[PDB]
Amino acid sequence: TRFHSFSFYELKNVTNNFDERPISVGGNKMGEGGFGVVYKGYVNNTTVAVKKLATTEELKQQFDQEIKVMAKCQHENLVELLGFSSDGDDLCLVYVYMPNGSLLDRLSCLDGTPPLSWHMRCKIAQGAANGINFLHENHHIHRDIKSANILLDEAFTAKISDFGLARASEQTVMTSRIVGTTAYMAPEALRGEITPKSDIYSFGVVLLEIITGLPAVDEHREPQLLLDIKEEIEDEEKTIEDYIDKKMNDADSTSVEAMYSVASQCLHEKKNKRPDIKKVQQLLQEMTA
Numbered sequence: 001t002r003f004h005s006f007s008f009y010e011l012k013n014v015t016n017n018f019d020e021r022p023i024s025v026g027g028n029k030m031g032e033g034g035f036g037v038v039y040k041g042y043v044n045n046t047t048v049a050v051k052k053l054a055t056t057e058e059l060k061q062q063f064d065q066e067i068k069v070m071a072k073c074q075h076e077n078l079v080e081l082l083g084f085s086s087d088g089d090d091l092c093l094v095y096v097y098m099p100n101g102s103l104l105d106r107l108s109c110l111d112g113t114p115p116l117s118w119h120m121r122c123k124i125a126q127g128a129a130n131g132i133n134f135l136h137e138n139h140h141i142h143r144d145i146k147s148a149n150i151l152l153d154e155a156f157t158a159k160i161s162d163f164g165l166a167r168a169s170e171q172t173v174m175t176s177r178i179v180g181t182t183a184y185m186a187p188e189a190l191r192g193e194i195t196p197k198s199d200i201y202s203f204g205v206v207l208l209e210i211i212t213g214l215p216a217v218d219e220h221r222e223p224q225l226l227l228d229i230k231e232e233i234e235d236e237e238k239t240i241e242d243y244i245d246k247k248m249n250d251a252d253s254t255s256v257e258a259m260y261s262v263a264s265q266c267l268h269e270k271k272n273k274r275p276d277i278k279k280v281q282q283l284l285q286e287m288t289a
C-alpha cells in the first residue's frame with residue numbers, strides 16, 4: 001500500500017498554522033504525547049487528524065516505522081493513515097479523523113463527554129483485541145499499548161494507533177533503548193526484552209482502566225498503579241465489584257468478572273504464563289456470547 005503525499009504548507013494552512021490551543025477556545029490541538037502534537041484539519045473534502053512530530057534521527061525513524069507498519073497493516077481496528085509530509089521543516093502524519101478521541105479521554109469524561117456504557121466498553125475491548133491480534137498475526141509488536149493509544153471513531157469502534165515504536169518478529173530480543181509507558185509496561189519490557197507477550201500485559205492494564213474508569217497511574221491514589229489492584233483482589237482484601245466504574249448503569253457482575261478474568265490472566269508477571277492474543281480475543285468474544 002502507497003500513501004498520498006501532502007505538502008507541508010497545505011497541512012499548515014488547514015490546521016490554522018498548527019494552532020496549539022484546545023478546540024473549545026478556537027484552536028486545532030486535539031491531543032499530544034505520541035512523539036508529537038495532533039491537530040484538527042480539513043483536507044480533500046474531509047476532516048483529518050494531522051500529527052506534527054516533535055534525536056531528530058530517532059524521530060524520523062519513528063516516522064518511517066509508522067508508515068512501514070501502516071503500509072503493511074490495514075484493519076478495521078487500526079487507525080487509517082491517509083498520507084504524510086516530509087518536504088517542510090516538521091514531519092507530518094495524516095490520518096482519518098477519530099471524532100471520539102482516545103479511550104483514556106473517554107474513560108475520564110474529558111471535556112464533559114458522557115460516561116461510556118458497559119455495552120460500549122465491551123465492544124471497545126473486543127475491537128482493541130482484534131487490532132492487537134492483527135498486529136501479532138503479522139509479526140508486529142506494538143510496544144506502547146495504552147488507553148491513550150486506542151482511538152474511537154464515529155461509532156466508538158476501537159482503533160489502535162502509534163506504531164512509531166513498533167517492532168517486527170517472525171524469538172525474544174533485547175534492547176538498550178527501553179521505550180513505552182511505565183504504568184502499562186510488563187516487567188521484562190522494563191528490563192529491555194522485546195516480545196508480543198509484553199503487549200498482552202499492557203492490554204491487561206487497559207482492561208482494568210475499562211472496568212474501573214481509573215487512570216493506570218495516579219499520584220494522589222492508593223495503590224498509585226492500577227495493576228496493583230490485581231493483588232488486593234487475589235488477597236481477598238477487596239473484590240472487582242469494589243472497583244467497577246460507578247459511572248455506568250448497565251454493568252452486570254458476570255461480564256465484568258469475565259473481563260477481569262481476562263485482565264488478571266494478561267497481567268501474569270511471568271511472560272510465558274500469559275495467554276496469547278487469540279486466546280484473549282476468544283475469551284472477550286465469549287463474554288458477550
Ligand SMILES: Cc1cc(NC(=O)c2cnn3cccnc23)n(-c2ccccc2)n1
Pocket residue numbers: 030031032034038048049051079080095096097098099100101102105148151161162
Ligand atoms: C477528538 C480527537 C480526535 C483525535 N485523534 C484523531 O482523530 C486521530 C486519528 N488518527 N490518530 C493517530 C494518532 C493520534 N490521534 C489520531 N484526538 C486525540 C486524542 C488523544 C491524543 C491525540 C489526539 N482527539
